[PDB]
RNA sequence: UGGUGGCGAUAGCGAAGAGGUCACACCCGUUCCCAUACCGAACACGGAAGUUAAGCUCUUCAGCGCCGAUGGUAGUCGGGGGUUUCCCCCUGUGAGAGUAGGACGCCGCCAA
RNA sequence: GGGCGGUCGCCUCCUAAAAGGUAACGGAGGCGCCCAAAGGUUCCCUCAGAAUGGUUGGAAAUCAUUCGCAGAGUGUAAAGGCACAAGGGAGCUUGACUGCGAGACCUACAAGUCGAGCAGGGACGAAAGUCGGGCUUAGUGAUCCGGUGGUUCCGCAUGGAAGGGCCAUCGCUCAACGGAUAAAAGCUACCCCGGG
RNA sequence: AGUCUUGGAGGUAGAGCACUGAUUGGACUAGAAUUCAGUCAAACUCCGAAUGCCAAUGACU
């Protein structure tokens, strides 16, 4: 039992308030944890990331669910 | 107003991060003396390195 | 294993590759008069250093006066760079 | 019941559609006397054009909507299904206000 | 009063009153448009006799759920000290649980 | 200490100190695929189990009733995710596409990952729009060498042909998975020799 | 680079419990499904903490 598989690389990609490039990569994630917001699409692996330059914020839907949205600069 | 600093001290044994603050402070020998003027940004690493440098308001 | 051991080899090499001599159609802007401009007087000067295969007249730059110009070949846009200036293109 | 179910319709085409950049959506009300229509947006909520009567033949006063809309008249609208099937009254009332000069 | 909304159920569920000229619902059928692992139940459809009994609406309840302190704690981020399969001080931000309490909704847009 | 055994790639958790990275002959498990459908699209759909009425009928296969916030399910193993459903049911289809690609992720490199948007042509729906394979992450290999095709380039004095280039495509368990050659066992100490 | 200013994560143990579990105390009683709740969880999850690093926009050095 001491074969491990290497750990995919997984995490945050950028910050709050930060000049994002459109298509840079963002939060990249299995599933579904962290739901899309304002100007952002998703992937083959479900990864987030931004389609027009602008910046970037952070925020919630219900009780317990944070989407990300792209402001335009 | 000013505000007088001075170490009582030294760098030698402390962590990595602490000798880097009172490098920008201006300090570099033991015993040594700076004037600064009163701030939130300078009283605040006064906070991280309080056992090293005895403050001296005037 | 090595990088360049890795990268697969290109196609193939021609036998006879036909490189003619190229100079900037700013060659002749400074020369004397646009007259018998043959390729042993370019040649001579030196303009050229070597005379190969053929003497090709490429279209980069601007042209002046009217010069005969003899070559092999002729791109296209330096065709008309003479032929506005008042120079003949004699292949 | 049959209102909760054209509701949850509704949103389901909702979560897929929304369009209101200044080419609003146009919703469509059908209750069991007359039928109600909604031009609206989505943060805005301006009803630019709103119609209503109060088979087909009020599908003549649903065209209308168009015909109200003939003031305005200034970008395309995305139709809105709601919880009806394109089949009946709601499908002969898109066709009719798209003659009248709406692009949709 | 209806439509579509905006806000993290404080919206909720539960319990009782109010109701409807209009609104909206049931209620009347399948003539076709369109319907069912089966069916005018639904989706359609075309019609206004009608109870509102429900849906919906207005108004109450801390029943359930939810939201939520203040203070003290705990473990530590500096720094210190002892008896160290560990323990104790001082400047540091400070929870959870628990209670006081919030609360049976607010805030837009038209339409009638 | 040499010997006996195993293991040498890829995937998910656990150690791995609350994220990138992170060890041990540390602890758990998986895989060398499957499926024209378990796919794309259009439109509908809510569930497992409890608790009654019996024709088979068992503490249990079905059967109509009161209920259920997921106790269900999703090709595969886990975790992350999900009932505005990705999960069920049908209509309809082959986008399981051609040329690409602003950029970014990852980090010695080689690779590997996601991609808005554009063009050519479609599918699907009234339309907006969606579609460059499966809820996400595993199911694979170098150059080298030969094989089957599409063809233009070249083709040694001139034409051809021969042969190679340039695209489509096959053969690797190379499994000691960044692959010493096509090819390869023990053996002996009085042992030769550099080392504890 | 250093500090403070503001909004941007992570579930480590402070932990206790709906889900999974180790269990038994007691079960329901056909001692298997499961009832009131005591326990412990490296592979248990409705909650928020102390530094950093991502930035940010300012300040001062």
Do not use: C, W
Not at chain 2, 32 to 52: C, F, P, W, Y
């Amino acid at each position: 039992n001491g074969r491990d598989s290497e750990a995919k690389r997984l995490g945050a990609k950028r910050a709050d308030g930060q000049f994002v490039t459109g298509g840079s990569i963002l939060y990249r994630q299995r599933g579904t944890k962290i739901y899309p917001g304002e100007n952002v699409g998703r992937g083959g692996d479900d990864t987030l990331f931004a389609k027009i330059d602008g910046t970037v914020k952070f925020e919630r839907f219900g009780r317990d669910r944070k989407k990300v949205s792209v402001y335009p600069v | 107003a000013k505000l007088e600093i001075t170490l009582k001290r030294s760098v030698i044994g402390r962590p990595e991060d602490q000798r880097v603050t009172v490098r920008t402070l201006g300090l570099k020998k033991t015993n040594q003396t700076v004037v600064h003027e009163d701030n939130a940004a300078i009283r605040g690493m006064i906070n991280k390195v309080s056992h090293l440098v005895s403050v001296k308001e005037q | 294993m090595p990088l360049f051991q890795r990268l697969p080899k290109r196609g193939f090499t021609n036998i006879n590759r036909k490189e003619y001599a190229v100079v900037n159609l700013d060659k002749l802007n400074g020369f004397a008069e646009g007259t018998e401009v043959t390729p042993e007087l370019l040649l001579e000067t030196g303009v050229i250093s070597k005379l190969n295969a053929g003497v090709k007249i490429l279209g980069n730059g601007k042209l002046e006066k009217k010069l005969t110009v003899k070559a092999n070949k002729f791109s296209a846009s330096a065709k008309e760079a003479v032929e506005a200036a008042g120079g003949t293109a004699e292949v | 019941s049959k209102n909760a179910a054209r509701l949850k319709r509704h949103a389901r085409v909702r979560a897929k559609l929304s369009g209101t950049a200044e080419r609003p959506r146009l919703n469509v009300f059908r209750s069991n006397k007359h039928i109600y229509a909604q031009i609206i947006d989505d943060v805005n909520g301006v009803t630019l054009a709103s119609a209503s009567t109060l088979t087909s033949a009020a599908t003549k006063v649903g065209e209308l909507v168009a015909k109200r809309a003939a003031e305005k008249g200034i970008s395309d609208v995305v139709f809105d299904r709601g919880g009806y099937l394109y089949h009946g009254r709601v499908k002969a009332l898109a066709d009719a206000a798209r003659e009248a000069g709406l692009k949709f």
